[PDB]
């Protein structure tokens, strides 16, 4: 039997993995940051309220100019908002109302969205005809889209329900790189700040660090109990934090290859739908489904503050690139911008 | 006080608001229906009765009422990660092949699917229409093949009506919260016309309950 001794080799190699990353944990991040003074109480007010959607929204994404944000919902619309004046600059009708993710291009020329229809449709905002229209539809991916993210105007990575992330080329319309290796279906995705590599999170309770060029998984990060729903890099690009159904946020390091800190409390038992970091990375913002957001001190693992404006599940959140504001969207059809 | 271009951007946003309000009034008056059930259980037969790659949309109108039917069984993943997208549906059309009682425990996994959908936290008030498909092939199959091989605890006659009523009592005894939701059960053949009438009669009670909820009467 080649088969049984092949898992004997795999179990020995995974034991070598656990021993190697056990040998690097000399002192935890709690022991390093006892000297650091805490952040104090973070109290953020609702500066804006974007009330245009008529159903549950599932995603938002900030633009790179920190003023335009897109938000997608189940009434077949994704609306681009002026965050400063609460103006709707576009309302794009969708071919399928079931949309679970949306993304904004870093150039600002494109938005992408996709859901249960298996297709990440890409919309051209800067048309000479004056209306937005479908640029390309990216099909052949056999599962619900969980997160689309642009690398530039031509590269886009998706994550699916068929346990598979894929890098696409928009002009040819064909997927160029296929990222397989996850066992349950991938739910979230986060690009690194240089966009040279990315992480994805699945229902394996496992996060995997990928590589865009060579196309193969480098590191695999375990430690969660239930399914991880959200993931986000630290702004250095050397760390990332995940969120799951455990009421735990855990952050990992790409160099140290393991856990660094767990963000949990006894009062919180519900799942985590969205994570993001601040601009300095000092505080991470987790969006829950006990209807509010918790501000976690990312170094000292303390609850800095609560963002409690929503009356349903906080489904999506994101921080601006200049770090001024936090917009949180939720299943009560309202976007709120916090500062 | 705004500038001229800020004023024109404000009136553009107000026209976008009027279009969104009009489309929401369009979408709020349409009945959404969720098809569930296993494959080869007469799902496509029911689609051809209402009419004549992840999610399949079906649009049909009947007695001045617009229906959208979402066949979602074409795409296969973990169902718990997207079944909350279908809360707020008007009704769930579940369908079970009656002639799959002997084939392979296929009736038992169909019961497990109805047990998972019917006692889900997102469908705690949704009324489930339970079609029972291929009753004629069931009635030739029960005279030759017994129904005790599906149900070891069954004791009853091998006629159509008592055995079909036994399968009805099982499927209506899957649910726990009897008070919250309603289950409408129908026996359908391949060639019958009354199924879209039965769906309409089941939808009208949900329409009455939401018309009371819109008028604050609960």
């Amino acid at each position, epitope marked *: 039997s080649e088969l049984d001794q092949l898992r004997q080799e795999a179990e020995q190699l995974k034991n070598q993995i656990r021993d190697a990353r056990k040998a690097c944990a000399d002192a935890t991040l709690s022991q390093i940051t006892n000297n650091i003074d805490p952040v104090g109480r973070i109290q953020m007010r609702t500066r804006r309220t974007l009330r245009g959607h008529l159903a549950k929204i599932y995603a938002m994404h900030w633009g790179t100019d920190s003023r335009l944000l897109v938000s997608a919902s189940q009434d077949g619309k994704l609306i681009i908002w002026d965050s400063y004046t609460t103006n709707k*600059v576009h309302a794009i009708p969708l071919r399928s109302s079931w949309v679970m993710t949306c993304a904004y291009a870093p150039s600002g020329n494109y938005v992408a969205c996709g859901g249960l229809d298996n297709i990440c449709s890409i919309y051209n905002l800067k048309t*000479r005809e*004056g209306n937005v229209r479908v640029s390309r539809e990216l099909a052949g991916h056999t599962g619900y889209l969980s997160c689309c993210r642009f690398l530039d105007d031509n590269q886009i990575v998706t994550s699916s329900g068929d346990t598979t992330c894929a890098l696409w080329d928009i002009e040819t319309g064909q997927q160029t790189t296929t990222f397989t290796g996850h066992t349950g279906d991938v739910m979230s995705l986060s690009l690194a700040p240089d966009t040279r590599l990315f992480v994805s999170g699945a229902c394996d309770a496992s996060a995997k660090l990928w590589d865009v060029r060579e196309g193969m998984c480098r590191q695999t990060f375990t430690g969660h109990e239930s399914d991880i729903n959200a993931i986000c890099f630290f702004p250095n690009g050397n760390a990332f934090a995940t969120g799951s159904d455990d009421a735990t946020c855990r952050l990992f390091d790409l160099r140290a290859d393991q856990e660094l800190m767990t963000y949990s409390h006894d009062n919180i038992i519900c799942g985590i739908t969205s994570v993001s970091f601040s601009k300095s990375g000092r505080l991470l913002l987790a969006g829950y489904d006990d209807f509010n957001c918790n501000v976690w001190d990312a170094l000292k693992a303390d609850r800095a503050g609560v963002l409690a404006g929503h009356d349903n599940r906080v489904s999506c959140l994101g921080v601006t690139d200049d770090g001024m504001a936090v917009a949180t969207g939720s299943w009560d059809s309202f976007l709120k911008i916090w500062n | 006080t705004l500038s001229a271009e800020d*004023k*024109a*951007a404000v009136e*553009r946003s107000k026209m976008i608001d009027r279009n969104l309000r009009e489309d929401g009034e369009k979408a709020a008056r349409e009945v959404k229906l969720l098809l569930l059930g296993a494959g080869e259980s007469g799902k496509s037969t029911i689609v051809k009765q209402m009419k004549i790659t992840g999610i399949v949309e079906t649009h049909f109108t009947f007695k001045d009422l617009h229906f959208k039917m979402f066949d979602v069984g074409g795409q296969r993943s973990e169902r718990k990660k997207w079944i909350h997208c279908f809360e707020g549906v008007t009704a769930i059309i579940f369908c079970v092949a009656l002639s799959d009682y002997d084939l392979v425990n296929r009736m038992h996994e169909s019961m497990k699917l109805f047990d998972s959908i019917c006692n889900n936290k997102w469908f705690t008030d949704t009324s489930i229409i339970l079609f029972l498909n291929k009753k004629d092939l069931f009635e030739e199959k029960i005279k030759k093949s017994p129904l005790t091989i599906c149900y070891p605890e069954y004791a009853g006659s091998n006629t159509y009506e008592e055995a079909a009523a036994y399968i009805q009592c099982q499927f209506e005894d899957l649910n726990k919260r009897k008070d919250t939701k309603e289950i409408y059960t129908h026996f359908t053949c391949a060639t019958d016309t009354k199924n879209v009438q039965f769906v309409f009669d089941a939808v009208t009670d949900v329409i009455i309950k939401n018309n009371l909820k819109d008028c604050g009467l609960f």
Partner: single-chain antibody
Amino acid sequence: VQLVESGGGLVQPGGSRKLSCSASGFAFSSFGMHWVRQAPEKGLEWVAYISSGSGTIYYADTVKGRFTISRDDPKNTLFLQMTSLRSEDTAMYYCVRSIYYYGSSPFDFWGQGTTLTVSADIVMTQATSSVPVTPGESVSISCRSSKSLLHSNGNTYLYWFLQRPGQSPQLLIYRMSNLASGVPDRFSGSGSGTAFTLTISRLEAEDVGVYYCMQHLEYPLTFGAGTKLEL
């Protein structure tokens, strides 16, 4: 895209005439439309404006009461009903599309023009009426505003246009700093409150024509008299 003017000709004074602008190739109901005229040896003069959905209509004060702008969205046609035509209404009339959201570029496309012959504002001052221009050399023109165009939101509502000889004008620089689409990066705009500069470094051929600067801070919109580039 295409905007086609029609309805000109010789009109007796005191008479009436309806001008028509037929749109083609763009989503016409999402666009605010303008009429801008040009007296046959003079500069550009703004006439009227109708917004999207016909909810906001402005006129110039020289034509207020006499002119009626109206649009018909299902057949994509812009109208200008003109009554009691005077001899100062002998001009060539352009219909202009313009859309206003965050980051939009209004006054981007202009119609070809119809020619009709009749038998407290912000004053924009072009500094020179004509400059001698050598090809290849850099040139830089300027105009000045009577009021500071820098609004409190950070925007400066200064638009630059170029009219080639015998052609419609086209947008070069919108909102003092931003290049229009299809315009080369030789053109550059710079300035401050009420003092503005359009720079054409490494001038090529077919940059030759009259250049107009326009404010869009307040209605009515006022142009300059035009700076002519001559070889």
